[PDB]
Amino acid sequence: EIKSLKHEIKELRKEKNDTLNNYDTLEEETDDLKNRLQALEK
Amino acid sequence: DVPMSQPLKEQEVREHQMKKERFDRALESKLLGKRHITYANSDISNKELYINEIKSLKHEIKELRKEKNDTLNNYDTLEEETDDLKNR
Amino acid sequence: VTLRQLSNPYYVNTIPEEDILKYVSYTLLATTSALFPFDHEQIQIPSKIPNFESGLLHLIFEAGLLYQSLGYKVEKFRMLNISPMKKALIIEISEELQNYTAFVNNLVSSGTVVSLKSLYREIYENIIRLRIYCRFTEHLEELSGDTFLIELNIFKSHGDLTIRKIATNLFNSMISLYYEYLMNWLTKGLLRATYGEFFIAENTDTNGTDDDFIYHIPIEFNQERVPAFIPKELAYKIFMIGKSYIFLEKYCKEVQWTN
Amino acid sequence: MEIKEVDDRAELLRYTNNIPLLGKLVNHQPLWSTNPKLKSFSLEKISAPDQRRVQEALVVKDLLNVLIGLEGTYIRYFNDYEPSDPETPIEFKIAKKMDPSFKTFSRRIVRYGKQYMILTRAYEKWSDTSFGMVLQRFAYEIRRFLEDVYLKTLVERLERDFNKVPNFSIRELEQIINETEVNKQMELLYNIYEEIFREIEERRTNQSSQNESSLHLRLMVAFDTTVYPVPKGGAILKIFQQKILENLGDRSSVMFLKKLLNNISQDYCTMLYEWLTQGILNDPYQEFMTYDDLERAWDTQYFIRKDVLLRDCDSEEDKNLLFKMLRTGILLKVVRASLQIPTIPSNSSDITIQEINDFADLMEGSNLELYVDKCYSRANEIFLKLFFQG
């Protein structure tokens, strides 16, 4: 039953990797809007 | 020309050797079969490096568990920043 | 102009290498550091330092924390009573620790290294040695001298050279005292200060049959405790030598010849 | 660059047995993508030719940070990178606002740094006993390289040129690296490691799958066709040999190949010399192609590990040579057991056997056959004498 628990933990890791991909696209959007902020300020 | 005939002495010594070899192989297969093939089903273990338990995996699980939360937290923060900067 | 000027405004809020060294001296010495508030387990590094510099200082403070944990472990093991072989093992560990201490003291006093990369490359051997000693002390409080020598002979077969060398040193330091026990038993029939690490033991547990040992000869020969580097026949011969010596000294009263 | 505030705390990893003995025991620093410590500066502000020098210097700095396995400001770790996972794929994301030529140079240098990190984790994991001390030696040698060739040349050339050399260009840096050829050596070693890992995978595929002359001989000899998941013993050296067969034409390549091969197989040829001169069997890592039982009461069965062989032993000549060597070792062990001696001194006969120094020369040359025939005749002489007179 330990292998099933490890598989469930790997599924949780996959879900968190999906959240990390969401974080990465959020980060690229943040970089784009930071460039926009710097362009509109200067 | 024509194909040469196989020598008589040759076939005689060949049949003699073949009879002797058949008898010898029958007798050898009859005597417990010294020929063998095995598969290694054993491995060495050295206590100091030999892991006392693999439970560390579940420990690492817990560790990764914590890390998971951190990611989520970081994600939230980024969102805020994004939204914040978006308002700007 | 120089490249330093191009990146000057980027790191105006960073700590120079001078204070970095002045405070890593305190941090690696297990002492407190004002620039880097040092907890017993956490270095608590400020975020002003860049992340790659953060990683290199993480390695440096990892070496420092290995030194501090080895000091804690050696203090703990010195406070506890151990076998003389374990005592010599602790002595070897303390020798390694003080050698690394003198090494880092020479590095601090001299300060010839200018690039932290070359500094880490120089101290990498000592870092690996300290890591090996921590890996060893992880299970030191559990194993006995026999398992100690087993793992030492194992690591002497290891493909690496430093592990093999350390294992050989510890094996020699333990086999010295093992030969000392052997010589004591062979010269005086004494099981003194053996700590159960000797294949011959004394068994005075009598159940009424010859309580005065008129014929019992309360000496036991443990075949399982006989190491591999000694034959069972030779171990039995040693046992019989000691038993006959005790028999002559105690029963036959041949004090002068036995002496 | 604005300093961003994150809680950076270095702690020793509590559990280390799941970490290789040469693996790192500290936690990794936070990631720039997750917990940046400095506010990044946009490269398009310095992508102009007048500010191209600032961008080039920052790129060179980030590349020097990557070469040692650390992240920078513009070239950050990839999305799948996990600093707490030793087996996760380690890639990098380069800033999109970088100069194209600078982007290609940074790609080359980040490939070099990634190969460095991969080989680092490789020899760290190879410090385990399951890979065999031989491979461990190789691992050691790898680290030796990274401790004497890669990091040394890096710190001596690239850091110094980036610090105290004006007019320095990333093109000049790449040309200097190509002059050092440490990048080419790392590339070839990475190809070797990829081939080794693919061989491990192929050994993992065949999970269910794995002569009358042995019965003709009055020997209790058996075969051991057990395949290991990782190459061990001669199967490693053969790869090296095969690499020597694949690196012909380049002198330095074959030189370094044979150098490492000898440095690693020194232990194996020492063990083989011990087996052929004393019959002493000592294989704590299952790397020698000969082992027996009793480690029927007096007769022990010898098993020949097919995975760690030195040759294919498929031809009749090779099979007879293997049988002769095994019989020599068996006769040596029998003589030692009968005479109750730990070792057989060389004065027991008029025949002496010298130790092997170069494994490649022993393989390509017949001096191996010379030694084998000599020790076999010596053992036959000694055994016949002891049985005819004793």
Residue numbers in the entry:
A (entry chain Sc): 164 to 205
B (entry chain Sd): 112 to 199
C (entry chain F): 165 to 423
D (entry chain E): 1 to 210, 222 to 306, 318 to 412
In the authors' words:
Microtubule (MT) filaments, composed of α/β-tubulin dimers, are fundamental to cellular architecture, function and organismal development. They are nucleated from MT organizing centers by the evolutionarily conserved γ-tubulin ring complex (γTuRC). S. cerevisiae γTuRC is built from a helical repeat of seven ‘V’-shaped copies of the tetrameric γ-tubulin small complex (γTuSC), composed of Spc97/GCP2 (SPB component 97/γ-tubulin complex 2) and Spc98/GCP3 subunits each bound to a γ-tubulin molecule. Here we used cryo-electron tomography to determine the structure of the native γTuRC capping the minus end of a MT in the context of enriched budding yeast spindles.
Subboxing of the γTuRC at γTuSC positions, followed by focused refinements, improved the resolution to 7–9 Å resolution. The consensus reconstruction and the subboxed map revealed repetitive densities for a coiled-coil protein that spans each Spc98:γ-tubulin pair and the first row of α/β-tubulin. The coiled-coil protein binds the Spc98 GRIP2 domain, γ-tubulin and α-tubulin, where the coiled-coil end flares: the density for one of the α-helices terminates while the other α-helix continues and interacts with the β-tubulin. The interface between the coiled coil and γTuSC:α/β-tubulin is shallow and is formed primarily by numerous highly conserved acidic residues on the γ-tubulin and α-tubulin surfaces. The coiled coils appear to stabilize α:β-tubulin dimers at Spc98-bound γ-tubulin, effectively positioning the first α:β-tubulin dimers of the MT lattice. Notably, no coiled coils are bound across the Spc97:γ-tubulin:α-tubulin surface. The observation that the coiled-coil protein binds exclusively to Spc98:γ-tubulin:α-tubulin, and not to Spc97:γ-tubulin:α-tubulin, implies there are Spc98-specific structural features that underlie this specificity. We reversed the charge of a conserved acidic patch on γ-tubulin (γ-tubulin D421R, E425R and E428R) that directly engages the coiled coil and that is the largest interface with the coiled-coil density. We observed a temperature-sensitive phenotype in a yeast strain with a mutation in the γ-tubulin gene (tub4-401), indicating that the γ-tubulin:coiled-coil interface is important for cellular function. Due to the limited resolution, it was not possible to establish the identity of the coiled-coil protein from the cryo-ET maps.
